[PDB]
Amino acid sequence: VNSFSGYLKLTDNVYIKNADIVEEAKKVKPTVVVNAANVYLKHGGGVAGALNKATNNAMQVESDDYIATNGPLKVGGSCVLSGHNLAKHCLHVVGPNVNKGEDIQLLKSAYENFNQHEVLLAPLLSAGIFGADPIHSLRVCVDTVRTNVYLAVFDKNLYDKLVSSFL
């Protein structure tokens, strides 16, 4: 039993809610919140800018030190950093940017990172400025993640369509 509330059950391990991941993180303080990051951990907009703004830029400060030491992530890769005031940890996961020509097949690799964590609060990867079809992203998630994932979708009309489609 966990403290995630009001999520619609999609599969055995995937639950979904029309909500802001920031507000869900502040309320639940999960062990792991997933960030939809880029390889440089530059958290400007989307989920990344939203999470970072909620940390008063501490996420960005920590991220800049991470990159200075380790260099950029791989597309499809991830790193574990602090969750600051939002969660214990933040798993920064890089989905492919299909508006940049990056390989959509890398979306499955990106979701594989979730399997290293028993429970996660996450957004759909590669949506938004990265341009992937949300229904596709949701389907890859269901077919790849085996741990317990709670999805927060912050677009009402998109959420409504996602919960009326097949997976």
Ligand SMILES: Cc1c[nH]c2ncnc(NC[C@]3(O)CC[C@H](C)CC3)c12
């Ligand atoms: C920006 C933001 C802030 N807080 C959030 N919580 C969840 N998702 C978010 N953006 C991605 C999406 O869920 C999926 C793609 C769609 C185009 C927009 C909604 C955000």
